[PDB]
Amino acid sequence: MEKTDEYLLARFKGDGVKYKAKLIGIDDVPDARGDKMSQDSMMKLKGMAAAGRSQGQHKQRIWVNISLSGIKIIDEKTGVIEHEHPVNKISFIARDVTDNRAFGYVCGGEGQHQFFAIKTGQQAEPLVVDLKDLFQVIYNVKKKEEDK
């Protein structure tokens, strides 16, 4: 079937959805959007994560929680909420064309942009689509409530 504003609302309401993953890294970036900018960060962070893995260091295991609250990065071992990014603070979702199991996003206010690189346990696409739908629903709701 098709995903209705009603369906999406129920999906992302409350604790929303949850995905198992690893935090590749965090990088300060100059702008809020950009394919090239995002790729450069992702490649550098993967380079760094690889240098670490060759010395026995592994990426932190996490849960990527998606809901109306936005995105929550949670430590899988402790359950501690490491980062929380409100939907209105996420400016760009970046697909990683070189990896079916990685993606990233830019968040923060102006002058304080950061790229978060994520390595998903499973395919990254479903997580990227959820983010797209989330933004879409928040919009459809606001526009319908504004037209009222």
Side-chain angles (χ1 to χ4, degrees):
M1 5 253 244
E2 74 161 351
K3 294 175 289 185
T4 71
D5 294 3
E6 182 168 7
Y7 167 78
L8 302 187
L9 261 311
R11 187 183 180 61
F12 305 125
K13 144 94 211 182
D15 283 316
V17 284
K18 178 185 69 174
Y19 292 93
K20 192 185 282 288
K22 293 180 185 180
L23 178 58
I24 301 174
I26 304 169
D27 187 42
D28 294 300
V29 297
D31 296 300
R33 296 183 138 255
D35 286 345
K36 221 307 192 180
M37 172 188 80
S38 292
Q39 175 187 293
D40 287 352
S41 284
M42 180 58 91
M43 293 298 93
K44 182 179 72 184
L45 293 173
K46 275 183 171 178
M48 289 168 92
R53 193 206 248 283
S54 80
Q55 297 296 316
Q57 309 176 345
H58 303 294
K59 312 173 215 56
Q60 172 186 15
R61 318 246 237 192
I62 58 170
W63 279 108
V64 177
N65 191 286
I66 302 172
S67 73
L68 275 358
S69 319
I71 296 175
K72 279 184 175 60
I73 298 299
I74 301 174
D75 184 68
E76 195 213 272
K77 230 287 84 177
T78 66
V80 170
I81 299 178
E82 229 60 292
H83 303 272
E84 179 178 81
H85 301 138
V87 175
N88 55 66
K89 283 287 219 166
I90 298 176
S91 54
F92 192 64
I93 298 180
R95 256 157 181 133
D96 182 358
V97 70
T98 76
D99 198 335
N100 293 165
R101 297 175 52 225
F103 83 97
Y105 64 90
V106 176
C107 63
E110 200 68 23
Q112 33 179 172
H113 303 289
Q114 291 190 297
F115 181 73
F116 282 71
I118 310 294
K119 221 270 153 48
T120 55
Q122 300 303 306
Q123 296 301 100
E125 191 56 19
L127 182 344
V128 173
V129 171
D130 268 330
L131 293 176
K132 299 292 188 175
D133 286 357
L134 173 57
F135 283 64
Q136 184 65 64
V137 104
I138 303 305
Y139 168 68
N140 287 329
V141 166
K142 177 183 65 177
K143 220 312 163 189
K144 275 186 178 179
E145 325 163 294
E146 260 176 52
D147 276 310
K148 175 171 281 60

